[PDB]
Amino acid sequence: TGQTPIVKANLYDDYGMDNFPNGFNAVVAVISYTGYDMDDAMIINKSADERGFGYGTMYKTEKVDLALNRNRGDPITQHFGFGNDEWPKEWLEKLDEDGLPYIGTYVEEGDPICAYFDDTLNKTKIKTYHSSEPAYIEEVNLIGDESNKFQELQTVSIKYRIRRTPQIGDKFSSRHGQKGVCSRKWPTIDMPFSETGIQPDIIINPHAFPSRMTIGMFVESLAGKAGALHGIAQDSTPWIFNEDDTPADYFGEQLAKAGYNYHGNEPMYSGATGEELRADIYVGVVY
């Protein structure tokens, strides 16, 4: 599930990048709260990606081909399917009667990808799934050969899908150069919570900002949040602001008309102790 950003250029909707959403809006609180995100790292709300926050898959395809060991009109010694010998009935769970696997089945390491009968040995060999990471079988293509002699299939393409739920140690990034792996999926009852009832789904350290000097991420927090309150998208193509009209003056008055403050800070509590924190916490939705 990709999203279009609150904060985008006017060239975004001109090349049609809504056709290809490469990220997602996230309530990002710039706060030293956790201790687990100090140097360059970050954390996620645990109940955010129990709901699908940042979830993606990985589609891997390999071609099993039974005719790369022969030449020039010999009898095809390897046929898909099961022969008439005493082959073990264990792998009816993965494979169909054609020696080809079923659509949707779950395959870990050691399971058969396909069954084929061999003529020079009189035995049903199986190729197997040579990967330590489990996958599901999405589609099986029967690549048929093109010739005047009509031929039994020797080439099969099989596509796997791998569930890449966001674990810790996965790199996320903003649109400003602020990368960093995940340290812990910090649970919701242990996260800070505002007075409006929300909780951030990303914590980023404020010590990632002064040496890096990315104030485009600070002003995306004011622009993203003030666009989420009003249901509007503010453009962010560069040099639409002067030194006279600072965007911190522009997006601050949009937050001040909604009830929030001019500086983009919110009064948040703690999740562990529950006390009122000292200063108001700099939050917002960046992409």
Binding site: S47, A48, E50, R51, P187, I198, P267, Y269, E276
Partner: peptide, 18 residues
């Protein structure tokens, strides 16, 4: 319970403000 997965929480949001 809601501590296992988020789907077992019967609550949209439950939070206070002083």
């Amino acid at each position: 319970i809601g501590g296992d997965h988020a789907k077992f929480s019967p609550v949209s949001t439950a939070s206070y403000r002083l």
